[PDB]
């Protein structure tokens, strides 16, 4: 009954959020075991934002130049090290609330939950998708950096995103938990175009499937199409080209709903070529593509 | 930077979710101090769903007929009591993770976060609004009952909703934490019309304000209107009539944005009378009314 954007319970990740101060810069860090991960641009003072030599800047910082607080507790930093665009502060105490976790680099088009924090304390949680251009359409203010994106499976938390900066278009760029930026972005104060924002076609089809599951069926047609046929009438609308894997990924949904995959593409083709006509699908007046096929199966169990 | 539906961190509420079994019925309960709150329709067997005499049904249940589990821990039920449509099982142990909390009955149009659970374990979290007709547009399946809605302020958790049933239209009805249903709904298996779904006009205006804050300004006009004038050209579209309080509530936003409240109404009037014209506002193709003015100020700090 019903369907909306649902983030994972943020409890397993709150117990890992801490405050990190390095000069005038304050932001958030992730405390797992006896290490604290944070964006390396903490060490950057104001006049080091255009082109900062992080090696040179880090050579001037010592362990005591990094103050970490897990609430009122102050963790002693006993060893720092820069890994890609991320810093690894080794604290003397291990987080007793460290959950079963693993660092993973999500693929473009996969969803994850974000826990926007400020000054170490969590502020809110919301679902995000790794756009095809490698940006995320998040909600971040100053001090938001260090906030992580994650997926929760069973008892294992898969961290996949740490916020770093915003782009000139309002969307955001970040890094995986190993320090490598998603996309071609770099942690320098310079204008960085994000690239054309494509639409995750597989997710859209996945979203139409929960529609039919929930009783929204006005978009279903007596039509069908071919895979190549659909991609030609979908590239005009900047849609990710549908592959055979995408078809297979939608297999479980197609098999459950009794609606063939290519029949959905035919229903999607008519939506791109004719619009919504003021109708609505799962409460939305546009085509949603931040619901991955796997997100649908779990919410529509 | 950016703006989307953001729920409160669900950590303070996960430590209070437990499993409740009474016969073939299994659902979720809220464990605060030495009491567990759950919907009274646990005691209802299948053939007691049309018109159940809860007094009669509860007279046949004993303390041992209620099994409560907080994960692998089994809490002993030492005293049960029905309060309105909610049961209060007194367990022998107090929840060590009980947060500072209070039970509150939210007003129609206020938002709250929901933590949909199943078999006692949390599944996800999402933002909801108490619709004017007293329903909520949630996402619930079988076994979802007992899931709570809450707002988090500082360290205090204000529980305001416990899910009970779905309506014939896909929307959901529930109770406050004192057992009283929101709206005229009752916990019986019978068709219950929800009433016309009005639009929280104050929230819509609030949502347009974050728009202008975030750089979406195409909807702003050289026009203005009068309070009575706007309400007449808004009742046709089933919009909550704007009051002077609503105006005052939007004062902080209006004063910050340099846009008078009635000027926003004029911009809203043209949107209702002319549509979106394919444009978009904060990523939405329709007018959003589940962002309360207070939700905007905290997300746009
Ligand atoms: C983290 O704390 C913030 C998050 C930002 C604030 C507004 N919304 C966000 O997503 N990150 C920043 O402010 C970075 C900090 C820089 C420090 C030096 C190294 C590079 C990152 N800056 C930006 O996000 C930034 C700079 C900039 C310049 C020109 C266009 C866009 C732009 N974004
Ligand atoms: C809680 O576990 C579920 C939540 C439902 C399941 C589907 N989505 C939901 O929101 N609650 C129910 O299934 C209730 C249980 C009844 C037990 C006996 C007392 C009344 C509640 N039933 C309904 O939600 C229900 C019955 C019904 C009959 C006719 C139209 C709608 C309708 N909804």
Numbering used by the authors:
A (entry chain A), B (entry chain A): 1 to 301
The authors write:
The two structures exhibit no significant difference, except for the replacement of the Ser144 side chain, which caused little structural perturbation. The E166V mutation abolishes a hydrogen bond from Glu166 to the pyrrolidone moiety of bofutrelvir, as expected for the replacement of Glu by non-polar Val, but the positioning of the pyrrolidine ring is minimally affected. The Glu/Val166 main chain forms bidentate hydrogen bonds with the indole-carboxamide group of bofutrelvir in both conformations. The carbon–nitrogen distance would be too short at 3.0 Å in the indole-up conformation, whereas it is 3.6 Å in the indole-down conformation for a more favorable van der Waals interaction. The Mpro loop centered on Thr190 concomitantly moves up toward bofutrelvir by ~1.5 Å in the mutant structures. These rearrangements allow bofutrelvir to form more intimate van der Waals contacts with the main chain atoms of Thr190 and Ala191 and the Gln189 side chain, making it fit better in the mutant Mpro active site.
Clinically relevant SARS-CoV-2 Mpro inhibitors, including nirmatrelvir, the active component of the Food and Drug Administration-approved drug Paxlovid, and ensitrelvir, which has been approved in Japan for the treatment of coronavirus disease 2019, target the cysteine protease active site of Mpro to competitively block its catalytic activity. Multiple studies have identified an Mpro mutation (E166V) that confers strong resistance to clinically relevant inhibitors, including nirmatrelvir, but the underlying mechanism is not fully understood. Glu166 is also hydrogen-bonded with the N-terminal Ser1 of the dimer partner to stabilize the Mpro homodimer and intramolecularly with His172 to stabilize its active site.
